[PDB]
C-alpha cells in the first residue's frame, strides 16, 4: 500500500545565552580559581551551542543536541544558573507560533528548548523517509517514538511552560500525534509481514485511538487560536486518517470473519470499511497525491473484497448480515512508546567539559 505523508514539527530559533561572563565570575568567588584557566572549556561549550542551535537536519544532529543537553546538566550541577540562582543569565528563544522572542534567566529554559528541538528534529527524520523498505519503516517508527519521548520528558520535568508552544496541552497533542505516526509505521510493518488479520486490526484500531486524541486536542478552542492555519492543516489530515485507519481495521476484521467462516459477518465488516473509506476520501479533498494514491489503492482492496463477499453470501452461503452495532468493537494494541530520554548518558555526552571545576 502507498504510504501516507507524516506531520513534522519545526525547530525553535535560539537567541543569546551569555554564560561566559557569569561562569568566570562564579569560579572566582566560589571556587577560588583564576577564571582564565577555563577559556578552552568555555569555548568548547559555546562551539557546542552554536552547532546545536544551527544543527544539521540529519541523524547526527540528534547526537549533537543530546550532547549539548547533557553538558548543560553538567554545567548547572557545577554553576548555579537556574531560576533565581546566583549565576543565572538571560536565555532567549523564539516561540514557534508567534515568532516572538521570550527571555528567561534560567538555564532550564535553554534545556527545554534544546529538548524541544530534539523531538522536533526526530519528527522531521521520521517524516522524511519514503518507508518503502522495512528498514526505512523501522527508522521512522523509532524516530517518532523518540520525538514522543522528548515531548513527554519535556512535559513532565518542566511542568510550568516557559512559552505557550511548550504548554502541557500542546505537548500532549505532540506526543499523541507522534505515537499515532509511530503506531502507523508499525501498522505498515505488520501488513508487510502478512500477520494475522485480527492482530493487524488491533494495531490499526490503536492508530485511530491516538489520532482521535490528537483531533480532540486540535478541536479545543485554545489550541486552534494559537496554532492558526496549522490547526486547520493538521486536523484535515488527522480527521481523514481517523476514518482511513478505521476502514483498515474493519477490513481486517472482515478477513478474520472470513477465516472464521462467518460470511454474514464478513459482509458487514467489509461494508463498514467501505463506508469509512468513502468518508476518508471525502475528507481528503485537496490533499496531495500521496494521500490520494493511498486511498485509491485501498479502495481497490476494499471495493473488490466487499463485492466478492456480498456475491458469495447472496449466492452460496445465505448467511445473515448483522448490523454493525451488534458486534464488539476492536480494542487497540498499544505497541509504541515515548522512548525514554536519558540526558546524562556518558556515551552520548562524552566527558564532562567542566570536570576540572571542583
Amino acid at each position: 500500500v502507498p504510504r501516507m505523508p507524516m506531520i513534522w514539527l519545526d525547530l525553535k530559533e535560539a537567541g543569546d545565552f551569555h554564560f561566559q561572563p557569569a561562569v568566570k565570575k562564579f569560579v572566582l568567588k566560589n571556587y577560588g580559581e583564576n577564571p582564565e584557566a577555563y577559556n578552552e572549556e568555555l569555548k568548547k561549550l559555546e562551539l557546542l551551542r552554536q552547532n546545536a542551535v544551527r544543527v544539521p537536519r540529519d541523524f547526527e544532529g540528534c547526537s549533537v543536541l543530546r550532547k549539548y543537553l547533557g553538558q548543560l546538566h553538567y554545567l548547572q550541577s557545577r554553576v548555579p544558573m537556574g531560576s533565581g540562582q546566583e549565576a543565572a543569565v538571560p536565555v532567549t528563544w523564539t516561540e514557534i507560533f508567534s515568532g516572538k522572542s521570550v527571555a528567561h534567566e534560567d538555564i532550564k529554559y535553554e534545556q527545554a528548548c534544546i529538548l524541544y528541538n530534539l523531538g522536533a528534529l526526530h519528527s522531521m527524520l521520521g517524516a522524511m523517509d519514503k518507508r518503502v523498505s522495512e528498514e526505512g519503516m523501522k527508522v521512522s517508527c523509532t524516530h517518532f517514538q523518540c520525538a514522543a519521548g522528548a515531548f513527554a520528558y519535556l512535559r513532565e520535568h518542566f511542568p510550568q511552560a516557559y512559552s505557550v508552544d511548550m504548554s502541557r496541552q500542546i505537548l500532549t497533542l505532540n506526543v499523541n500525534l507522534m505515537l499515532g505516526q509511530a503506531q502507523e509505521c508499525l501498522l505498515e510493518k505488520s501488513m508487510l509481514d502478512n500477520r494475522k488479520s485480527f492482530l493487524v486490526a488491533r494495531i490499526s484500531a490503536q492508530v485511530v485511538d491516538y489520532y482521535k486524541e490528537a483531533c480532540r486536542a486540535l478541536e479545543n478552542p485554545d489550541t486552534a487560536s494559537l496554532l492558526g492555519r496549522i490547526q486547520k492543516d493538521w486536523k484535515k489530515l488527522v480527521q481523514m486518517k481517523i476514518y482511513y485507519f478505521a476502514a483498515v481495521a474493519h477490513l481486517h476484521m472482515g478477513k478474520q470473519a472470513e477465516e472464521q467462516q462467518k460470511f454474514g459477518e464478513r459482509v458487514a465488516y467489509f461494508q463498514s470499511a467501505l463506508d469509512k473509506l468513502n468518508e476518508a476520501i471525502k475528507l481528503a479533498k485537496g490533499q496531495p497525491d500521496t494521500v490520494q494514491d493511498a486511498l485509491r489503492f485501498t479502495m481497490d482492496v476494499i471495493g473488490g473484497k466487499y463485492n466478492s463477499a456480498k456475491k458469495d453470501n447472496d449466492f452460496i452461503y445465505h448467511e445473515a448480515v448483522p448490523a454493525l452495532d451488534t458486534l464488539q468493537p476492536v480494542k487497540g494494541a498499544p505497541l509504541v512508546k515515548p522512548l525514554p530520554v536519558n540526558p546524562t548518558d556518558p556515551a552520548v555526552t562524552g566527558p564532562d567539559i567542566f570536570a576540572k571545576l571542583v
Binding site: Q145, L186, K189, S190, D193, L199, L335, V336
Partner: peptide, 11 residues
C-alpha cells in the same frame, strides 16, 4: 506469536 517479534521491532 507475532507480537513478541514486533515488540523488539518497535525498538
Amino acid at each position: 506469536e507475532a507480537l513478541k517479534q514486533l515488540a523488539e521491532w518497535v525498538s
